[PDB]
Amino acid sequence: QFNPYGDNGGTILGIAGEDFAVLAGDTRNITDYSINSRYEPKVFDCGDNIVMSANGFAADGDALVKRFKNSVKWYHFDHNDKKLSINSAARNIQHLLYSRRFFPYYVYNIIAGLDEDGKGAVYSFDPVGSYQREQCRAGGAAASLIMPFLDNQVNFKNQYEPGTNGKVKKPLKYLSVEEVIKLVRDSFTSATERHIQVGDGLEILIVTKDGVRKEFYELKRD
Amino acid sequence: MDIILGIRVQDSVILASSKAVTRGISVLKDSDDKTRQLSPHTLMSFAGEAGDTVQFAEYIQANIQLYSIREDYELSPQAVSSFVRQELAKSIRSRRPYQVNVLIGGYDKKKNKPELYQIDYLGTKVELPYGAHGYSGFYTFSLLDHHYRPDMTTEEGLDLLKLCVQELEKRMPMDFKGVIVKIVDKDGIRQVDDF
Amino acid sequence: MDIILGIRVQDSVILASSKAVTRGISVLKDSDDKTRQLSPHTLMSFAGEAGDTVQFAEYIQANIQLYSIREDYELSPQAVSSFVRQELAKSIRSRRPYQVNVLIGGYDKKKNKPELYQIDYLGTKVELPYGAHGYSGFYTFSLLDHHYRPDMTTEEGLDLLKLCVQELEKRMPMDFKGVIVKIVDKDGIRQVDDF
Amino acid sequence: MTDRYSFSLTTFSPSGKLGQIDYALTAVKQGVTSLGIKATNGVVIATEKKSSSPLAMSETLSKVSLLTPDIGAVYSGMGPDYRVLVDKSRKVAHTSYKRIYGEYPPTKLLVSEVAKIMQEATQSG
Amino acid sequence: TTIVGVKFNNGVVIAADTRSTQGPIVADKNCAKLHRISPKIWCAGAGTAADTEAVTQLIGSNIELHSLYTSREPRVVSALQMLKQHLFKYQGHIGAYLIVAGVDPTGSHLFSIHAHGSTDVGYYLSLGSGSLAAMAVLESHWKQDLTKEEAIKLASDAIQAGIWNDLGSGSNVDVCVMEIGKDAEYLRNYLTPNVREEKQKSYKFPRGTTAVLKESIVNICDIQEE
Amino acid sequence: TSIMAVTFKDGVILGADSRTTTGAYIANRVTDKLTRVHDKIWCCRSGSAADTQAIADIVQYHLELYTSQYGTPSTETAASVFKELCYENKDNLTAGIIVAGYDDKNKGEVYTIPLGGSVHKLPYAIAGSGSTFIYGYCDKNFRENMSKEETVDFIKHSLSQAIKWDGSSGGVIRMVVLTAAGVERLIFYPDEYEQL
Amino acid sequence: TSIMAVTFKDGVILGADSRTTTGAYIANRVTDKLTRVHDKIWCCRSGSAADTQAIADIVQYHLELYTSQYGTPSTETAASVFKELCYENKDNLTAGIIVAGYDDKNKGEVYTIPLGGSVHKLPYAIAGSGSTFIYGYCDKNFRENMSKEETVDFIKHSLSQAIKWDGSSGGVIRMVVLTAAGVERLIFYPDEYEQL
Amino acid sequence: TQQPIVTGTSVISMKYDNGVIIAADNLGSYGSLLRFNGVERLIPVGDNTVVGISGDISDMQHIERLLKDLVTENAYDNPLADAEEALEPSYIFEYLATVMYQRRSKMNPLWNAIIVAGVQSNGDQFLRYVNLLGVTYSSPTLATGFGAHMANPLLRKVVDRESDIPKTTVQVAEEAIVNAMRVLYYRDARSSRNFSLAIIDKNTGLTFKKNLQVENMKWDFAKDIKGYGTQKI
Amino acid sequence: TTTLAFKFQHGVIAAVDSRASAGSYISALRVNKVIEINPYLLGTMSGCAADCQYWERLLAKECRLYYLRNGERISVSAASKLLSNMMCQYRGMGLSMGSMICGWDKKGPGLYYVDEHGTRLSGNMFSTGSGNTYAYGVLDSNYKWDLSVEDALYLGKRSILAAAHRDAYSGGSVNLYHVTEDGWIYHGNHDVGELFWKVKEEEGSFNNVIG
Amino acid sequence: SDPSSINGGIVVAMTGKDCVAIACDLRLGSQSLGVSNKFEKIFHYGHVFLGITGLATDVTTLNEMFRYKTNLYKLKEERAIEPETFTQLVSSSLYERRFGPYFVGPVVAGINSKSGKPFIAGFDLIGCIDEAKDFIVSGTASDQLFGMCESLYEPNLEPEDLFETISQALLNAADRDALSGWGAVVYIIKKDEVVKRYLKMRQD
């Protein structure tokens, strides 16, 4: 029997800063125990200061991104070159996903950018279109390895102030872009050690008011 | 849903229907009225798959109300029961059938006679002095076979109905949370608020 | 069978067990005692597959009674519960396992303390202040979590137990025909004849 | 056929002696001398290679036997009985210890196992 | 898993990678897949890890007893025969896929053995999920009359192919060389091409960060005197 | 797998390919499917490698013990031992074996034992997945009392075609000659047989 | 079923057996599997009789209409129409067809269309359940530019062996010769071909 | 939904300094039967692209016709059909990828794995993969089926990453491809000795080599291998 | 998941948890399980998140269009029915949605339960999700119509806490809402971890748990 | 259904400088229902510690079994069993049920009383030993624990620093697992003193 779905592996990570946002993902593409590519880009600049990554089944992921990029193009045509806000893009993507409620895009999608007040924003989707705005989200193969670490090191969960013994929590101080990138690199280096589908390379897209910048880092190739 | 009973006495038809609604392992409601008034002298109780029951009942109600307005006339219980049967017989060979069993209690103003019709989801119609759907009849029909007369009063019909519910409450494994009882006679439809 | 509850208070253990037994679609009995006295100060209630429950309970009873005669001494509730657990852990990997869940309520005369043990058919043992098997806990544990204190009297334990049964009677789809309640304390085992 | 000797061949006499054990000890007495000496940093075991014929190659007959890499044995008495005890001793070191704990048994416990085998030949049928 | 075996002039060499997995997760990054049946008879195993180790220890135990009984050094054909008859009996339910190699008074030997009980002979063999990547290297570079140094290279190159290209294989390369008239040399972590880079940050916490309810001393000593 | 055994004037010759597959992967391309159970009694194996190896090992044990007690066994006796194992354990085996041997009294003989455990004595036999493609060729080209050189050519040509069409077959062509003169092993490489 | 088509010097010859089975019962022992879709374009049918008859009927219709508009179609064109039906309806068909025809420009041509709906132009082709047993024989004995008499003997000998080993094949051997001279039908009975 | 009948095995390819190389054997298998021995599975599109296809042959022949029709259609009302508005490898690939994903989305796939190899207008190397699921990816080396398991490891030793491409010559790349095809013949049961190889270079154009054979094979060591363990004769 | 809603003297309370799971893995600690349809209408979420979001945001479209056409606010009865009729079209197609439509209209405060089968029930009290049984116990024993807004908010909050404790697929945080005739009022996000310890101390409950 | 995830729970062990640590959650459940918040999964036989995750009946059974075997070991050997030796005993005992296994994930932790060397090891349900230098994880949140341990862990930590590292690895892994939590315990082990600490965590 024909199985229309597949698993191309990969892992992605989105973090929202105070005035910036990052969307990272490894560059390894796989089927079963084979490597297809050590560098196959997974996070895309979709225009209007929005970045996107559809992780899971690469054929559905490429189709969704391609369709969203197209939706941005037609939003400009139809509404006098108005900029598509991150919240508006998120709602649009929900409707793209739910158009296939009964033959879903097999992907977990994340977008990142800035909201209309200039603050950092990340939105997270399930395959059928449920979405919500988030601060931190790891998606894909090694999501379960990374998210607990982010709960601890980004939101300071289970961390209290010494001397008080559990009475006073550690205060939620904001993180810089340099601090976030460190947590991203360590997240993927740790994931690469314990997950066979994660490795080869790491590509990060950083979003600020100035635009979209890229950073690439090697990962273990075993 | 679960339990629906009907009994036709001398001058009226009495319908008794359970109050329980269950989702998963939890009883969501214990005061549910499993019935719709089709016309001033015709009442339909129902039981079957979740959702389908109310949708079907309200669809039938709308059609009979439409007929009443168009002709300025109330259809006989027999005519209504035939319309309902046809809709179910139509439904059973559809892509997705409506899994609904009904009792139709009506008072024919022309003939001055009460009438009870039992119709299952296949479109199987029978006119009866007393009837039930599902497992309800397994517990109650022996009592009805014994005690039923056609010249019974409404009060005697209610007493025989109480005995049926008591037997159900004793020997059924499921708690159906009692019954709502309604009477259909020459003066129309009324609910017995204490049972 | 269906429902078995247990609660350990200050100076006693209280076990409540349903009275219903169902074969097919018919409730055969509404006064069944789902319990066996293992020793003068140790009571075991049980629930699971038909037949297996009583056979297992009586087999355990025979073994504990044999021990009592041999040593002229009553085993502690802890010792009995461990023996029972081992028999179930032994049973789960047998050709045909005994599908039985139990609560063991006992009063330790040495330590002067009531003790309640919950053991499922796999041989999963836990000592608890209050316990249940099957779905019973889904309805009752929120009430017990709220109202339970370890210094409660036997009378307060019974009142909290009544509230649990009332909640079960409201939200469970199955009619379990009330419960038989038994108290285990320093003076032994006695049944509450009005509940 | 079938082994129909299911009863003990070693029994207590009126004086409380176990005859067959005493007689076995007498056989040991007739055997060639062997000895053992324990030092601070080692142990030595020795015996005489009493060759039955000069045409026999006495190198092929080993009176001192390795049981484990760190345990050795020597005997006095009946050679064939020793040979089979060494076979059993080597095996029991594996089956009742090494296959369980992943290491060779300590001297005292291997001795305990050999002793058990010898006790059973004193009571079994 | 990637394991190989290569014959050479005066002996035989086997090698393996060091990753053990539970699905996509890596359980152990430095597993030891090279096993000792006897001093000069070593085997590498793929498949079910508990089974390869268990069947290897059992046959190695019985081989040791056989060697003591016969006053002879153990032969590879004996380990081979004892393994295949044990595996055959359990009809593939013991998931042990091994490459067995060694030297004995008869010479140098190299065999493979599958879980159902079939054995093969060869000058070069490979087993595991990375066997195809390794065999591609072996078929490209193997030749007759290899030297010890050429064979170790070929073997470790074959393992590397599996490490890099097979997701079920990774980390390091283990080797064992069995040459005639010599002691076998076990080269644990012969290659180490997958060391983790330094982390960007230290995640050492301030003392008192974790909330605590109760503290207590645990009595691990026995019951005391007086 | 492509295997065959052919009787001729001076005795019998066994022939086989050298491919072993796990699906479409070639696990071994130089397999030896010609197995010795006695000095001049050999077998060709097809089916489960585990099953056929286990069987041939047991048979070799039985004939070694037979020889110690009663002297050199007949080829018929060897085939009977094979049959007894293949027939009584037919539910748990997948073995297709051809037995071939040389006596001085009976000369060259060939017995084939297919899946069920039945025995069939023949002038020549073919078996394995690749045999299907050469039923026509072998039937048309086989003659009785051929010479050694003619018989070698017949097996070489036959297995060449079996290998050509069957993906489960390939590699080298191994042959074993059984005569009064002794036991001769032959091998023929792809560059030789592919151009036939 | 055993069917084949062979090109030679003067044109092409189609050949087939005559057995149709429903399980082990022979529903028809004198079937005509050589089907005409145009004057000098014929086909050999294998697989579902219902499917292959329905297809050949539709093809005959298409080529009759082609001829009325554009004149005599090529053998390649006929094979394309067969292919289009077999490829587009592959989910609901079980048809193995060999197409053979004679032009004056292109001379004898043979196209085989297996289950998937692919097309393969060949010097000769074999198909049907009985073809498996003659891959070796046909490969060894086929030559290009044979005479009519040589080609008839080749088909006769080949199908004789296919029939011998395949239970699904048998009966008579029918042949159709396609040359410039015209169309010649041949038939060969069991007593003739069995003794080859 | 279907099942593949007549099939083609591995297609292997790699980038080198001035272009790309792609190769595939000439076999059409019918299950375990090596039915057809003269099948071309490399299909050139113009003088700048070669599409290599594995999987179902009937679907391959269908794709072959789509590509032939694509060339015809591009020439329509196009004076620059043999110049600026000629078909590019990227155009040809994206078309196929669109078709493959659409077919899987109707649950009626083309049961293939395709590699499009070519050189773009600006001299850039093009090498991308697409299959029956519509899954696409690109890498310095690409291979289908068994080639993915056995050929890629060998080809990645030559070009392990992007920076190795300018250091790799056409002689080295062709040598690696030819060696890989030999290894597949040793180890793939659905492979043949005969194969085709195509080179698309930005200077020398398209070189299409037919009727190539696997040579320099090692088999001699087989004579020494006897039995399966204990047998000596 | 645990959701609840009940009518009382001073309107309707709506309380939900915040956990989302993918097997044993907790994919989200804080998801919003209340949808703000309009300023006078709320909707709970249980089942498939996507189905609940899509169909209830689509209900909002339809409830807004109603207001434009008729210049009046839609009733809770009519809104619940529109939603149940959408479910009835994809009847059998595999949707998973369990919700309670909370609001205030001309008839007073309103509460309807609606599920994927097309079921539509009016009632004073409802609870859905994997932890509804635990919530019902607290509600049934403490519910009165004479409840103050302060006590009612606590009841719905304490009821979710009961479920978050026992049910493994329920937890994270509690979101509270109060619906008045002047609209709905959000009463914050309350971490269950912190809330639990707080309730234990102040109430004396959860004696079995050590803190 | 899956026996290894019915009751839930986790165990993690770490090496430090002249010390080891082993920790566990306290939850026992019947799938979604939490039953006990006092179900400790770490046991000790002399100075050797054993953590067991998986099916609770088998956890209880195996503890009783290893108590049985270590008590006899001591009577015969006249000494307490060491971690290396105990690890082999656990492996042997599990593989003897190769075709009817205990559905567990054991973890050994201890310090050799003679060499003073810290030791940890993990097993699969069938006996395969994982002798790691750094850390061992087991349970329904093993993926989560692998992520925490791989990033938080560094070698040669002192007892009071190791405590914080292992506690945070467990706590944050358990808070991303529905079937783990409801309390936690950590054992800090040195050559001749052992401290046991109950952690405060969210009870949902």
Ligand SMILES: O=C(C[C@H](C(=O)O)C1CCCCC1)Nc1ccc2ccc(-c3nc(-c4ccccc4)cs3)cc2n1
């Ligand atoms: O409702 C349930 C599950 C059921 C329940 O507990 O009763 C379970 C019963 C037991 C079987 C399993 C299902 N889950 C809910 C409920 C409301 C929800 C509301 C919003 C969300 C959002 N999830 C994302 C999101 C998540 C993961 C990744 C990306 C986005 C965004 S919004 C998820 C929600 N999930």
Ligand SMILES: [Cl-]
């Ligand atoms: Cl073999």
Ligand SMILES: [Cl-]
């Ligand atoms: Cl026909």
Ligand SMILES: [Mg+2]
């Ligand atoms: Mg009826």
Ligand SMILES: [Mg+2]
């Ligand atoms: Mg790898």
Ligand SMILES: [Mg+2]
């Ligand atoms: Mg025939």
Ligand SMILES: [Mg+2]
């Ligand atoms: Mg919870």
